């Protein structure tokens, strides 16, 4: 553009929330920077007693 862009037109918020909630709900991650993709990390809390 002939005039400067303002960051507010592009700075969004949902990515962090999506990553966090999916990561915790599914219980499997992809730490591809650290080359770990562990799974089975989280389990439902039992309530039999």
């Amino acid at each position: 553009r002939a005039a400067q862009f303002d960051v507010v037109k592009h700075m969004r918020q949902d990515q962090i929330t999506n990553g966090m909630v999916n990561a915790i709900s599914t219980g499997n991650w992809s730490l591809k920077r650290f080359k770990m993709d562990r799974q089975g990390v989280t389990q439902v809390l039992s309530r039999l007693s």
Binding site: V8, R12, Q13, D14
Partner: protein, 359 residues
Amino acid sequence: RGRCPDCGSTELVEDSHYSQSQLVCSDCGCVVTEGVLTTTFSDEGSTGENEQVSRSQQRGLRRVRDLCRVLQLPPTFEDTAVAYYQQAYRHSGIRAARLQKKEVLVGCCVLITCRQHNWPLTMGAICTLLYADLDVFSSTYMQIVKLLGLDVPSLCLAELVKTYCSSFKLFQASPSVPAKYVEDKEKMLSRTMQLVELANETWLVTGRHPLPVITAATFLAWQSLQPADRLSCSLARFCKLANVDLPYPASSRLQELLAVLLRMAEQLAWLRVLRLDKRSVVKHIGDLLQHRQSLVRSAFRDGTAEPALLLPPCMLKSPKRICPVPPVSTVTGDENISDSEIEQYLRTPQEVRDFQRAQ
């Protein structure tokens, strides 16, 4: 099958005693005497067919998605607005229009979408982002709506106040707003609702921008909840503490409502005895609002089923004369024209040369 063993069954429905699948039929209270075993799926592990789309068109789609994610609102708004964008991107003029019109388009689509789900929003919030201008996007909006002929609700008066009033910083203490400025949201919002209900029926809102009305109502409601600490404030002096900007027409609405309440007050002796005015009436509205409907029907001159006029302000000024019958007429435009009038509209050669010298 179809039939029962012989006779007139043709329908099929399922029933089964125990973990089975048998085809109920209904000429005999039967199962078509046949049944068949349902076949099903699972224990392993909405279309594709995605068009590659024009490059600029998908650029537009990317802008669409990035926009409404500002509102961090349900993705369904995203998806339906995108569907509307595809519906719109089917016309030559839309394709040939300059990209600024497309940018304002990606906002008007979200506007209509939010209106369908009556999600509160206002033009300014959207247009602060798109580098938009009132003429540009308003004309584009009219064009799109009248092109597609889509129905869409209007901005409900009470719809916007809920989110607007919650945006104030009056509900907790701060150095800008000490306790004498702090106030409870419930009381003021109830007062503002009781004020806007007065606004429309008094014709105040029709044809006007509403947000000035809301601003004046909120300012006066906040004042009158603790006027002794608040009658010293002012519109701007207020709005700056909560980081709010105010309309210039807010003063116009304030004058209108002050006149309305001074008209209201004279109907009750135990309010008339105080000889109320602009300075004092603000602290008395808490008493007036308890008898509002009684004040109205003692105050309006229009006592017909369908002392002061309960008519919109645009006529409260009174016509200079009340629209006598217009002079519908015709003329004999076939007459000969006077050449003198025609020649007077011509420059002399002297004037022609003067024009040449000046030019």
